[PDB]
Scaffold this active site. Structure first.
Site, mmCIF file in Angstrom:
data_model
loop_
_atom_site.group_PDB
_atom_site.id
_atom_site.type_symbol
_atom_site.label_atom_id
_atom_site.label_comp_id
_atom_site.label_asym_id
_atom_site.label_seq_id
_atom_site.Cartn_x
_atom_site.Cartn_y
_atom_site.Cartn_z
ATOM 1 N N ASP A 133 0.822 -1.205 0.000
ATOM 2 C CA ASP A 133 0.000 0.000 0.000
ATOM 3 C C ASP A 133 0.859 1.260 0.000
ATOM 4 O O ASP A 133 0.581 2.210 -0.744
ATOM 5 C CB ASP A 133 -0.946 -0.027 1.196
ATOM 6 C CG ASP A 133 -2.106 -0.984 0.980
ATOM 7 O OD1 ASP A 133 -2.755 -0.886 -0.088
ATOM 8 O OD2 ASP A 133 -2.356 -1.840 1.856
ATOM 9 N N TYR A 193 -9.801 -1.644 2.213
ATOM 10 C CA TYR A 193 -9.093 -1.441 3.475
ATOM 11 C C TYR A 193 -9.065 -0.002 3.963
ATOM 12 O O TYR A 193 -8.893 0.949 3.190
ATOM 13 C CB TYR A 193 -7.605 -1.835 3.404
ATOM 14 C CG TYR A 193 -7.299 -3.074 2.646
ATOM 15 C CD1 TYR A 193 -7.259 -4.300 3.323
ATOM 16 C CD2 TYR A 193 -7.037 -3.053 1.269
ATOM 17 C CE1 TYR A 193 -6.967 -5.492 2.662
ATOM 18 C CE2 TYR A 193 -6.736 -4.244 0.565
ATOM 19 C CZ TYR A 193 -6.707 -5.464 1.293
ATOM 20 O OH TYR A 193 -6.429 -6.676 0.717
#
Ligand code: CU
Ligand code: CU
Ligand code: NA
Ligand code: NA
Lengths: 620, 620
Positions: B290, B374
């Site tokens: 990420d 997420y």
């Protein structure tokens, strides 16, 4: 109405009268322990039977007794003389704290050692420490306390800054005899003071701290009924209090829609042990079971609004008995309040465009206890999402020694000439499990690494394994942080909508367990602490991991003796015993009063609910 | 005035003009990354030189460039074409998220697979996932994204409840080609919805939650000057913000009396990796960095007062650049506030009769980020007693799959036919240490058990050992919870009044590290995550544990390549890299939106102060 209500003053007066009429509470007697007994398994008997267990000490020298009485039926139920050389001494009496300093103040050998150090006897405080069991054969059968000396320069001085090293005495507090006085050498008494309220030491106080105001304008979201029954955010439980264990939690349950689902029948900290790692003979015998030997509940502080407990706080004031059977109220001994706990759940979805945020909350239930130089906060937390957490907060003043010329591998230096022996604080949580009822079992869960190969061609796979503990002889378990090891308590006969057995997962902190050599006296008396996890079959009298009489017991009682029965625990009424603690290598910043350090554990639902249990929480 | 001030809108416009006049920002160009560079070692040069690093992508297909510019001197400093088959692709562009779903919507093979499942194409969302490096040789040199399909039943539907298993496609987003479409079999699309705002699913909302009111009537105790310089309760620091790393902390220091003592020069989360453990070829390639691939800072949420941040909150709104070099403000992207933290220190002394209680407090600095399903909260905490803590909060929606007929060892079932693959969330904290200055070193500290015998006659002794890491080749360390292992960063040339080197102790949570096979692609690209602790010699360009270009890099860059230099770290300018994360075996209670789970680390002073640093705290 509830059989789990706190003992009342009236109930305790009644206990003292029943012991009086029965001629068990004579002027030579002392109540060393008094507590309500929990209702027996299957409380389906209409109307309770409030029973009380009492330990009775005889100052004159007679044998002590264990007595059970029923206040419901004003009758003595049983009364048993005790052979304390066999089964262990009774807990340390509060009135015995002074006797060691007074007995030593007239002893010739004590005064000789003080005069060689130019110490004025009226200035020497003596700490009453538990004796343990070692090599002195004349101690068997006798009520013994050891004494360590600290100098107080003036009434408000912190004696902890002035230990008198190289000196220890032993004392028999029944016959009032100084059995031994050992003087292994003179050490300089550390001179710096440790008075943390002296402006000289603190400097000017800060003017930079603006106030934080925590209020609940509509009052708290939890309700108390019947004295000690809590209902809060689908949780339900009773707050008990025992002079040995402290705060106890009974009947912890969760209201899942319309039915009330039990989780834990009884939760308590059932023992603590503080072993010291200094091998010097002045101290190598030092180990305190604060719970077992001293009873932490009877030293519960009164908690001040605004200093100890901040916010909209509801207090409980439990009643205990003094040495003579008179009721004693501990005003504001228990704090309970809810606090904000940040974000519970949050998601902004790219595709639905919906933004979603919820706050978390916890119920807090706490008390604080002081035993000599040590202070301990016991915190139980209940969270919106079903999690249960325990936290111990350790502070107070570190136990001190001299710092030897040219150093030590077992002691930290905190100030010129002032040392702090290495030690641990190890707690035993006793969890009488009731996961959706009493048919429970424990699986051990390890992460499983997989090798790159057929069926795992890219080498990314990993899994997990669960091992069921079926007999007590295989339920003595060790942590393994490296494989992610946790323990699941499940109910094999209660399933969720996916047809999985409901369960709770225990998350341990994985701190080191008892460091002492396995052959030591302390590894024998504190066997529970050599391992992280124990599971036993429930039994009414299997209450403490060390047994009922810790003081000067030679070891083996409690957990090692229970599991020997090798009982079945696969789908039964079981008890989980979790060992966790802090290994304290003191730092300069611990002196002269130490900032809080913490340790604990938590239990999270694992397939217990059919979906998240906090879908119905508002946004506010 | 400060060289560590946040980038301004004006500064970013200036960057776009300089790239324009220089002819580097043509209509085929995209800014994939823009950030201020930190001042170089020895900022003793009068007046700063605000420099900016820019990654420039070419949508037409030309080679991308790495550019440095000085806004102080309106000049391009360097400009370098990149061979991305060699050194890695550029970060994923935000505009590329849609291209995968649009490219697939006209592909014959894609539509064939959808029609065999009776899926209406306008209802299929496609997630743009990073490709990684595997066995497909035609991907080398190309900008590749893989696509996983989820059904949205209506615009506000949660697609995550409806994965389309057995189906994956690969996409080249430069030439716009669907290179592959793999259909390994039809799985039923799970039917239950997961809409956590539907009253049908939530039931009636609770009316039991009373409000908690947290106010500061005299305002907050911290001050902000110059945009981002914090002073609070003897702490001092600058809050930076980078579109890749997110919140960064510079110049963390403690005012010990009259002199300002540095602790940490730069603190950041320098990478995160989310590897999946499902070996199914539909997903066995799934791993997201990420931080490295997507840049978490550019997806920072706007935080709402009362929902995300509660209390007297001060906001920062950082400025970043969009794909075209226009300044973009993230309104209320950073929360900062102080909160009460219970008891700091407490003791009631039996002998002095003095009762003493102080409260603790923490400074909170946080932001929240969303990448697809997420959401992540990054929390830095500063405590009165010198402790520094980091906490990651993981929530959002779990990544979903079908649950296979008769189960899986690598997937959890969350609802009928609905699965959740096992995975990890692993973070890398990069700690540029400055313990009382730049001459620092790292010792490893283990508890030492001692055997009962001579010098340890009662078998109670235990000690500790410290091993100095002198070269980089020996500074690749593993956790060992069982021996209490911690790491001390000390300054050998700065001592406390006991003549001990001042130091800070790093306390790790000891969670499992990367579970993948050591021969996997992911163990190669995410080598930092196979070990708990790394120490390097500081170097200006050693910024990320994975290197500058994570996307589709073949592995080895970053930490494994730095430590190969085998540089000296015994009393030098060093950087500590700590790996910590969560191993997620999803539970039913994670669905349909998951309650927060946490992981972190903390640093506590270890002989840094000459006594407790909180003696001067008032009682209030
Ligand atoms: Cu301690
Ligand atoms: Cu996860
Ligand atoms: Na049970
Ligand atoms: Na450094």
């Amino acid at each position: 109405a509830s059989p789990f209500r706190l003992a009342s003053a009236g109930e305790i007066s009644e206990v003292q009268g029943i012991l009086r009429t029965a001629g068990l509470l004579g002027p030579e007697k002392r109540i060393a322990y008094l507590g309500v007994l929990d209702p027996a398994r299957g409380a389906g008997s209409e109307a309770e039977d409030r029973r009380f267990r009492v330990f009775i000490h005889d100052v004159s020298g007679a044998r002590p007794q264990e007595v059970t009485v029923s206040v419901t039926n004003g009758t003595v139920i049983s009364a048993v003389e005790l052979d304390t050389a066999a089964t262990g001494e009774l807990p340390v009496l509060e009135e015995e704290f002074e006797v060691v300093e007074q007995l030593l103040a007239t002893d010739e050998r004590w005064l000789k050692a003080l005069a060689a150090r130019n110490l004025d006897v009226s200035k020497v405080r003596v700490a009453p420490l538990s004796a343990g069991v070692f090599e002195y054969a004349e101690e068997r059968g006798r009520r013994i306390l050891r004494g360590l000396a600290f100098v107080q320069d003036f009434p408000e001085d912190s004696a902890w800054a002035h230990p008198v090293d190289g000196l220890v005495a032993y004392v028999d507090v029944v016959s009032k005899e100084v059995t031994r006085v050992i003087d292994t050498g003179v050490f300089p008494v550390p001179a710096e003071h440790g008075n943390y309220t002296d402006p000289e030491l603190t400097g000017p106080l800060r003017t930079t701290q603006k106030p934080i105001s925590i209020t609940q304008p509509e009052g708290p979201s939890f309700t108390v009924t019947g004295g000690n029954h809590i209902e809060w955010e689908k949780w339900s439980l009773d707050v008990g209090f025992d002079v040995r264990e402290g705060v106890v939690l009974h009947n912890i349950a969760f209201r899942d829609g319309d039915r009330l689902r039990p989780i834990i029948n009884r939760a308590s900290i059932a023992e603590m042990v503080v072993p010291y790692g200094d091998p010097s003979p002045i101290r190598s015998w030092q180990n305190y079971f604060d719970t077992g030997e001293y009873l932490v509940g009877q030293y519960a502080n009164s908690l001040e609004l605004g200093c100890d407990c901040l916010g909209d706080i509801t207090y409980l004031s439990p009643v205990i008995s003094d040495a003579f059977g008179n009721p004693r109220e501990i005003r504001n001994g228990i704090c309970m309040h809810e606090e904000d706990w940040g974000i519970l759940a949050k998601h902004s979805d790219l595709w639905s465009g919906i933004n979603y945020t919820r706050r978390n909350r916890r119920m807090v239930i706490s008390f604080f206890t002081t035993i000599g130089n040590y202070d301990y906060g016991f915190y139980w937390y209940l969270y919106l999402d079903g999690t249960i957490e325990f936290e111990a907060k350790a502070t107070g003043v570190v136990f001190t020694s001299a710092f030897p010329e040219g150093g030590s591998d077992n002691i930290s230096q905190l100030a010129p000439g002032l040392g702090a022996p290495f030690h641990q604080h190890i707690f035993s949580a006793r969890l009488d499990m009731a996961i959706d009822g009493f048919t429970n079992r424990v699986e051990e869960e390890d992460v499983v690494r997989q090798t790159m190969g057929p069926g795992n061609e890219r080498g990314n796979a990993f899994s997990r394994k669960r091992t069921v503990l079926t007999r007590e002889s295989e339920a003595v378990r060790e942590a393994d942080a490296r494989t992610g090891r946790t323990w699941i308590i499940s109910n094999p006969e209660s399933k969720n909508r996916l047809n999985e057995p409901v369960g709770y997962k225990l998350h341990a902190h994985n701190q080191p367990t008892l460091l002492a050599d396995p052959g030591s006296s302390i590894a024998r008396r504190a066997a529970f602490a050599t391992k992280d996890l124990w599971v036993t079959r429930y039994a009414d009298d299997e209450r403490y991991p060390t047994g009922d009489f810790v003081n000067q017991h030679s070891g083996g009682a409690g957990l090692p003796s229970y599991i020997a029965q090798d009982r079945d625990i696969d789908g039964q009424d079981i008890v989980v015993w979790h060992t966790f603690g802090l290994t304290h290598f003191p730092r300069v910043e611990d002196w002269p009063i130490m900032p809080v350090d913490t340790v604990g554990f938590k239990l999270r639902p694992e397939g217990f609910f059919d979906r998240s249990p906090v879908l119905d929480v508002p946004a506010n």
